[PDB]
Design a protein around this ligand. Structure first.
Ligand SMILES: O[C@@H]1[C@@H](O)[C@H](O[C@@H]2CO[C@@H](O[C@@H]3CO[C@@H](O)[C@H](O)[C@H]3O)[C@H](O)[C@H]2O)OC[C@H]1O
Ligand SMILES: O[C@@H]1[C@@H](O)[C@H](O[C@@H]2CO[C@@H](O[C@@H]3CO[C@@H](O)[C@H](O)[C@H]3O)[C@H](O)[C@H]2O)OC[C@H]1O
Length: 184
């Protein structure tokens, strides 16, 4: 299954991330800045079907249970958000996509002077699919990423040709909580 472990924090607050056995990981976090922790693949694919089971999902603040990855050419950070805490992420509304039993809202946002895979202070577009209501957790779940890639394409949101990592993540900003996720 997975071959990659992602564990990044801007150093704000506490992010206690555990690289577990196989595709399993856990995070306990408190009063954070920006962070992203997850398991997945060093090289993303628009054709990948990601499976996971979030045995524990207990955010608050801005904390997302999300497919997370990058492309370059152009530099794009993308999300397929299945669940969240207190605040649901949104941006510029494009449309919707139905996939894996859920309806997701498609949004774009822009990050300025921000950390990325390309450096400490960079500018990049973010693509989002955000589930309309929180996905149930604790059972096996699939994200059929091709559905999202295709839907994004239809709204002129094209991904880059150079694929970086792709993980099923716990990601947050000004957030506290616990997660435990297995990815395959
Ligand atoms: O090979 C695949 C298996 O790995 C997959 O097994 C699932 C693995 O995740 C299990 O859920 C965990 C239970 O413990 C909690 O603490 C964790 O947070 C959960 O992730 C789940 O029960 C298994 O079915 O099944 C499909 C195979 O293809
Ligand atoms: O040397 C490089 C690493 O430092 C680099 O780490 C990336 C730093 O940017 C992170 O993106 C932020 C994640 O949090 C989100 O909320 C924000 O949108 C982003 O600013 C990214 O997760 C890290 O991978 O990785 C590549 C190395 O070359």
């Amino acid at each position: 299954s997975t071959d990659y472990w992602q564990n990044w924090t801007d150093g704000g607050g506490i992010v206690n991330a555990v690289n577990g056995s196989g595709g399993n990981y856990s995070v306990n976090w408190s009063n954070t800045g920006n962070f992203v922790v997850g398991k997945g693949w060093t090289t993303g694919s628009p054709f990948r079907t990601i499976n996971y089971n979030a045995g524990v999902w207990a955010p608050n603040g801005n904390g997302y249970l999300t497919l997370y990855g990058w492309t370059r050419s152009p530099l794009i950070e993308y999300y397929v958000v299945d669940s969240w805490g207190t605040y649901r992420p949104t941006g510029t509304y494009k449309g919707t996509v139905k996939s894996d039993g859920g309806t997701y809202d498609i949004y774009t946002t822009t990050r300025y002077n921000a950390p990325s895979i390309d450096g400490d202070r960079t500018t990049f577009t973010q693509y989002w699919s955000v589930r309309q209501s929180k996905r149930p957790t604790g059972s096996n779940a699939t994200i059929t990423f091709s559905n999202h890639v295709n839907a994004w394409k239809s709204h002129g949101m094209n991904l880059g040709s150079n694929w970086a990592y792709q993980v099923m993540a716990t990601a947050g900003y000004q957030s506290s909580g616990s997660s435990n996720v297995t990815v395959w």
